[PDB]
Amino acid sequence: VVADAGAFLRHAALQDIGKNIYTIREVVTEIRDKATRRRLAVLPYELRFKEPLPEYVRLVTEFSKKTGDYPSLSATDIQVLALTYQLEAEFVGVSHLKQEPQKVKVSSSIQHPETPLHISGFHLPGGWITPSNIKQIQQELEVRVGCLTTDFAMQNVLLQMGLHVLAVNGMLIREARSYILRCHGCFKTTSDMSRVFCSHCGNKTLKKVSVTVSDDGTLHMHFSRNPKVLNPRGLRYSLPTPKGGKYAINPHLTEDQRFPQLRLSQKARQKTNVFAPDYIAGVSPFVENDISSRSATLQVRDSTLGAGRRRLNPNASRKKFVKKR
Amino acid sequence: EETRKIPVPANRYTPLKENWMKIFTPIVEHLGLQIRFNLKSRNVEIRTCKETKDVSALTKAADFVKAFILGFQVEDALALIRLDDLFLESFEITDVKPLKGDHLSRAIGRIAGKGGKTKFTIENVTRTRIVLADVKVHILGSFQNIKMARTAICNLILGNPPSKVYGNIRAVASRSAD
Amino acid sequence: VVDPFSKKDWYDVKAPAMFNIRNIGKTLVTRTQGTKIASDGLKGRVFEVSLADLQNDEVAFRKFKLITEDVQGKNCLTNFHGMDLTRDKMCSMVKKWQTMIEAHVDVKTTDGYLLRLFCVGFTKKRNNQIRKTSYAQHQQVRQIRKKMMEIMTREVQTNDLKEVVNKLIPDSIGKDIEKACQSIYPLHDVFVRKVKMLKKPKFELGKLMELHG
Amino acid sequence: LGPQVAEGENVFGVCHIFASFNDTFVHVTDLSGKETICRVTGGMKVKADRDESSPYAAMLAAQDVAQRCKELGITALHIKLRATGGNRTKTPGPGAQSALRALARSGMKIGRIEDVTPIPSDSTRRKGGRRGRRL
Amino acid sequence: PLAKDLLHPSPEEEKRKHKKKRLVQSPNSYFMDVKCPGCYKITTVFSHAQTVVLCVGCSTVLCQPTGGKARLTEGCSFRRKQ
RNA sequence: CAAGACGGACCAGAGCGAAAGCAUUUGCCAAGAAUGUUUUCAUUAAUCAAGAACGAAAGUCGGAGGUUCGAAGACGAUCAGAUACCGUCGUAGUUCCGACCAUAAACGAUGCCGACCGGCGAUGCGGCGGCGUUAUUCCCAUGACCCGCCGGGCAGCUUCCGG
Ligand SMILES: [Zn+2]
DSSP states (O other), X not given: OBOOHHHHHTXXXXXXXXXXXXXXXXXXTTOOOHXXXXXXXXXXXXXXXXXXXXXXXXXXXXXXXHHXXXXXXXXXXXXXXXXXXXXXXXXXXXXXXXXXXXXXXXXXXXXXXXXXXXOTTEEOOOOOBOTTTTTTOSSOOOOOOOBOOOSHHHHHHHHHHTOOOBOSSSSBOOOEEEEEEEETTTXXXXXXXXXXXXXXXXXXXXXXXXXXXXXXXXXXXXXXXXXXXXXXXXXXXXXXXXXXXXXXXXXXOSTTOOOOOOOOOTTTTOOOOSOOTTSTTOSSSSOOOOOSSHHHHTTOOOXXXXXXXXXXXSSSOOOTTOOOO | XXXXXXXXXXXXXXXXXXXXXXXXXXXXXXXXXXXXXXXXXXXXXXXXXXXXXXXXXXXXXXXHHHHHHHTOOHHHHHHHHHOSSOEEEEEETTTTSOOOTHHHXXXXXXXXXXXXXXXHHHHHHSOOEEEEETTEEEEEEOHHHHHHHHHHHHHHTTTOOHHHHXXXXXXXXXXXXX | OOOTTTTEEEEEEEOOXXXXXXXXXXXXXXXXXXXSOHHHHTTTOEEEEEGGGTOSSSOSSEEEEEEEEEEOSXXXXXXXXXXXXXXXXXXXXXXXXXXXXXXXXXXEOTTSOEEEEEEEEEBOOOTTOOOSOOOOOHHHHHHHHHHHHHHHHHHHHTOOHHHHHHHHTTTHHHHHHXXXXXXXXXXXXXXXXXXXXXXXXXXXXXXXXXXXX | OOOOOOSSSOOEXXXXXXXXXXXXXXXXXXXXXXXXXXXXXXXXXXXXXXXXXXXXHHHHHHHHHHHHHHHHTOOEEEEEEEOOOTTSOOSOOHHHHHHHHHHHHTTOEEEEEEEOOOOOSSOOOOSSOSSOSOO | OOOOOSSSOOHHHHHHXXXXXXXXXXXXXXXXEEEOSSOOOEXXXXXXXXXXXXXXXXXXXXXXXXXXXXXXXXXXXXXXXO
């Protein structure tokens, strides 16, 4: 029972479920959540710290770069993987695990990658969200040793190599359903769904591809056989000359170009929380907007705001009196 | 058990998809209601269950999700869940004044102002939230606050400059015993 | 001083045999006071009933107007008067980047009920489309409108109210229009949006019996 | 006094909630709609023309009309929300929302919510001039 | 830009251009020889023919006028002349 | 039930027209740009004093009609001085027919025709070339999408061409 940081973020109190609890210092000390550090001094102390061996982290990296997941992995992640590897090797016999895993099998469909399947509240033609089910919706929930990993990359490598891992649910998991980003220029796959530029060739070219991994160790990934996904419509447009200074915003063509620092003030990024015990004493129902600061005059916006505006093609026609920032 | 269904437009599908968990978590935890999103009819459907705590919570949920769909932020309709006396007046810009074409667009501009600042200024004086659909204006707040915001907005789209609007709305807020 | 509601009577009102749910509900009527007859007072009422209150399997965005025509001792039989769509549905159907095509016909059925049919249909953005708008040209729109007019004219003139109403409950007309108009331009959301009762023949009793049971 | 219906089945009424820009109207009728059971205006509760369109007046109207339906035996109501419509504003105001919330609060089952305002196909000329309306 | 051999452009480039904006004017049409499936009589038909043409020894339509190129009836064979 | 009115949402920096202007269905009438042509005429052209047609709204004559709105006008509120704002009603007018007037911020505050000088990809119409998905796999063409190209347009973005 090797606990990853995902169980600690989700308040997964599975300490009574297992007995061989082993954790890393750098998977518990980096968490900036206050409630986790609060409950850490409250939770019963039967977890213990263990260090992996350099040979086993070397082997774990050796087949993890054959799985095609090594750029997506992190150092403490490899610590967790090789810790579980060492525990299952030292307790259980080593003949269960298999190395140099299976090949991929390609089977595409007509469905869009943005089809809203496997969302709990979404239902095509009954799927309801009940307070009996709010504790149930975590993931695709299906003996002695296991993992408490929430990342798909960890589940992927642990299941390709062959360990039975589990979730916040007490029962061991069977299938892994998720999405990955694949470059369609260099054909390199990254398990990090947040990024937009690929690590290999750096173009803004990652696209979603669905991946399902069975309990045997066989993986199959579905592409989308849809002409809308691979369409060069809104891609070539005339670019402005690069401007410098403290105020210039650039069209963001590379993943690591140096942008000028344009942050928001504290009052500008306060969101009203309504379930605070002292919210009712507020003279206004809402947090007051910020108009006085210099960031308000410069029309500085959050990264989240204006997402569908970027998805419009620049070679189009907007409204006559509107200006796009 | 009874239910309410509310529709969603095409442009409001993605904000519903992104903020989905922040929508259905207070509906299912504090109110105790079943919720789903019918994709064929494109309707958010909320029904009462056996473990619903009290009546009129379904109407709170309907107001919450409808306010989110109209364009308000998820926190601003969580305010509708918690508070009692909050309402939604909405009206067309061409209602008070017959405007055609470009003039109408300029009216929209002076509801926003530069950078939206004028709009935010009203949100500081009337203590309300205001959402601009393409020809429509939605106000969320208390009744006298909604009326104050509506007078300010109608003063803006009859030609009055923002300075007179700020002065008048601050005077009215001063006499409002706030 | 005197409560006028002690002089009132509660009659039961029932749906025709076309629909699964019969019991529409209760109806208030003043008592017979010698001069005016209580049965004559309620003989010209229009009942607004949703389709969800008429059949369990069907959809709820359709409304039926029903005329009460006879009184059977605290029992009211209704006759079909009209059909309409929910305004919430109609508000949801009108999207911007598409073309709305509307048609209307004045058509007489076999048993003499002269009706007015309205049909609406929206242009559809297809599966692999990249363009924002899905506008159809004027001649294509005219051809679609024509095809609706002969479809409704053909499928009303040869039937009676039993078959017409049994067509309007699952909307065979809309699906037939959608199937037939695929050769001109693919359509998104086509329905018979409103049905009006222009003319009725002479009122009988055996017709209501065979319509109800 | 009331219908002779068992405790399982419920009877339906149609509550025309008409929230004009001066008061509110609560017109509870039969499913036919011809005969009125009750109608509580804003002006029947508050003795002030300033408070005529207040949500408090609509709340009191909804409470009194729900008491009237419980005295007769109406237990579930369909709702037809209305604004002034026509040339004027089409969207129902805060008074209609307050009345519906107060009527749902007082133990009454809600059926179908229907936004029936007299929306013109093509309007006549507006009440104000070319200058405008509402200050 | 600033270095273009206007005297000798590539044939793809001149084929792309408008027929009056070529270096030397040349039409986009031709004269096609059509053979009916029934008769053996060969007929010269202009590629953008505006009139409906009938076979001399068959009295059958060969092409139908359109906005641009006249479309051929089904079963007829055509060969471009030089 | 009737009366006159208005053609919302679809409605867009989309289209047409010399401009003012033009938005329910269908039928008729006479026009029009563009595109396509290895058709015909062979300079027949451009701008145009004099002169001639059209010309928003408001207004004036003769007829009809008056639903809404509504200048003037009548009241009601409001004040050291209010005689503009606000509320109710309402005349001419707003509607149609036939005669008048020729005026607008009748604006792109930018004459018309013709040539050359950077780039880009969206859209409307027409034409050309095409793997494919579709009309429940359509038996052939045809409509809708998709990818390029050319011509005329309504526009946009970008640029230290130069002003
Ligand atoms: Zn790449």
